[PDB]
Design a protein around this ligand. Structure first.
Ligand code: M75
Length: 164
């Protein structure tokens, strides 16, 4: 069903994450972590304190798809075990902010062709697939986008609900 998912998404905030490669999304799915540049790190930390759920929706550049979505479970923190991200050319690990813990809600893919009817008011009402890394997605658009993903029957949202 979709009822616990809708509960998790109620009054949530949504952010588009545009990964340079599949390897970084694979690492995030395996380890339950994400790291971003300080400009986005600051936005996500502010959002984490402001809302019952902050949802990251992931898309690998040139894939034509989203790869899933996850909920922030912490603010960013430094000093963990290093994560061997595959960084964009011209970028060192020192340029990253801290590490966010995340709980995956859906690890299934959604092709952009299925989200063509959804536009993001916070990005000039362009299709929600369009946006820079860290673009906030307005509540209604973000909720409908998440509801379009195939259900991920491997995930039990009971655990996610208790952290809210
Ligand atoms: O270099 S990043 O700020 N973070 C990670 C490498 C994991 C980034 C690039 N594209 C989206 N986010």
């Amino acid at each position: 069903g979709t009822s616990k998912l809708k509960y998790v998404l109620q009054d949530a905030r949504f952010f588009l994450i545009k990964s340079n490669n599949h390897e970084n999304v694979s690492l995030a799915k395996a380890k339950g972590v994400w790291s971003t540049l300080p400009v986005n790190e600051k936005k996500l930390n502010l959002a984490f304190r402001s809302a019952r759920s902050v949802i990251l929706i992931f898309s690998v550049r040139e894939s034509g798809k989203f790869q899933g979505f996850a909920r922030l479970s912490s603010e960013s923190h430094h000093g963990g075990s290093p994560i061997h991200w595959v960084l964009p050319a011209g970028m060192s690990a020192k340029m990253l902010g801290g590490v966010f813990k995340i709980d995956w809600i859906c690890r299934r893919e959604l092709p952009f062709t299925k989200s063509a009817h959804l536009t993001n008011p916070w990005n000039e009402h362009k299709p929600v697939k369009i946006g820079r890394d860290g673009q906030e997605i307005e509540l209604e658009c973000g909720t409908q986008l998440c509801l379009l993903f195939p259900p991920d029957e491997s995930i039990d949202l009971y655990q996610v609900i208790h952290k809210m």
